[PDB]
């Protein structure tokens, strides 16, 4: 996260960390959507151009965390993946269209003040909240600059009009992607950055006061560049795939 602030404690209790076992390192963020299901970006798991193709055993997930590097004893929980499911039509060859994946944990994670799932949207939640100007919130432990934060960072960024997104880039934008960010004229700034990929873009419904996850941090051309925006997986467009995967392979 570029230009954020420090998260408060339990502010983002769905925030998960995708953590490599060997060497020990942050890869991506992710989000807790049930007691045994974590949501992340497909490119955190599979991105062939960079020889990235993880299995369940290469990775750990860390839920309950605030501090990036420290082992938060009595607070965080660390989980082993039991299965990865990459969206079958995730386009790594072109533009990261359908940049979504699920991970089934080996055992259900126990909730607490620091650990609590986020909601996924319905058709009505999306209709109502995915509108240009409406702000969501992005969280992560990624770089503060295009250096690294002690604790989890937060930034609130406005959803940007569709035309404005396409015209900021030569990459082909699809319906499964929205972009967010301030314009050079709006004065405020902020963006996701390296290591933040996979993490949640969420919005608090004004109707029921529940946090829903509308996007997944998916890509951008640099971090916090004027006239450029970060792109997010449109989580509601790919949710029938989410439910499908959970309805079949879940317990």
């Amino acid at each position: 996260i570029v230009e954020g602030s420090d998260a408060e404690i339990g502010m983002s209790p769905w925030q998960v960390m995708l953590f490599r076992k060997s060497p020990q390192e942050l890869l991506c963020g992710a989000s807790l959507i049930s007691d045994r299901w974590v949501l992340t970006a497909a490119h955190c798991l599979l991105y062939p151009p960079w020889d990235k193709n993880f299995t369940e055993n290469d990775l750990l997930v860390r839920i309950g965390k605030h501090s990036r590097t420290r082992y938060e004893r009595n607070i965080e929980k660390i989980s082993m993946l039991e299965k990865i499911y990459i969206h079958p039509r995730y386009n790594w060859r072109e533009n990261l269209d359908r940049d979504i994946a699920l991970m089934k944990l080996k055992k259900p994670v126990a909730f607490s003040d620091y650990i609590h799932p986020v909601c996924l949207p319905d058709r009505e939640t999306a209709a109502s909240l995915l509108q240009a100007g409406y702000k969501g919130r992005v969280t992560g432990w990624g770089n503060l600059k295009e250096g690294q934060p002690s604790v989890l960072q937060v930034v609130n960024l406005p959803i940007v009009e569709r035309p404005v997104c396409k015209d900021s880039t030569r990459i082909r934008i699809t319906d499964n992607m929205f972009c967010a960010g301030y314009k050079p004229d709006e004065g405020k700034r902020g963006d996701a950055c390296e290591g933040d990929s996979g993490g949640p873009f969420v919005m608090k419904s004004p109707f029921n006061n529940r946090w829903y996850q509308m996007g997944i941090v998916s890509w951008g051309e640099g971090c916090d560049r004027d006239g450029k925006y970060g792109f997010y997986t449109h989580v509601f467009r790919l949710k029938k795939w989410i439910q499908k995967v959970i309805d079949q392979f879940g317990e």
Partner: peptide, 10 residues
């Protein structure tokens, strides 16, 4: 940079 997570997780 990262503190060692207990070996039971590895």
């Amino acid at each position: 940079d990262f503190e060692e997570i207990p070996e039971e997780y590895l």
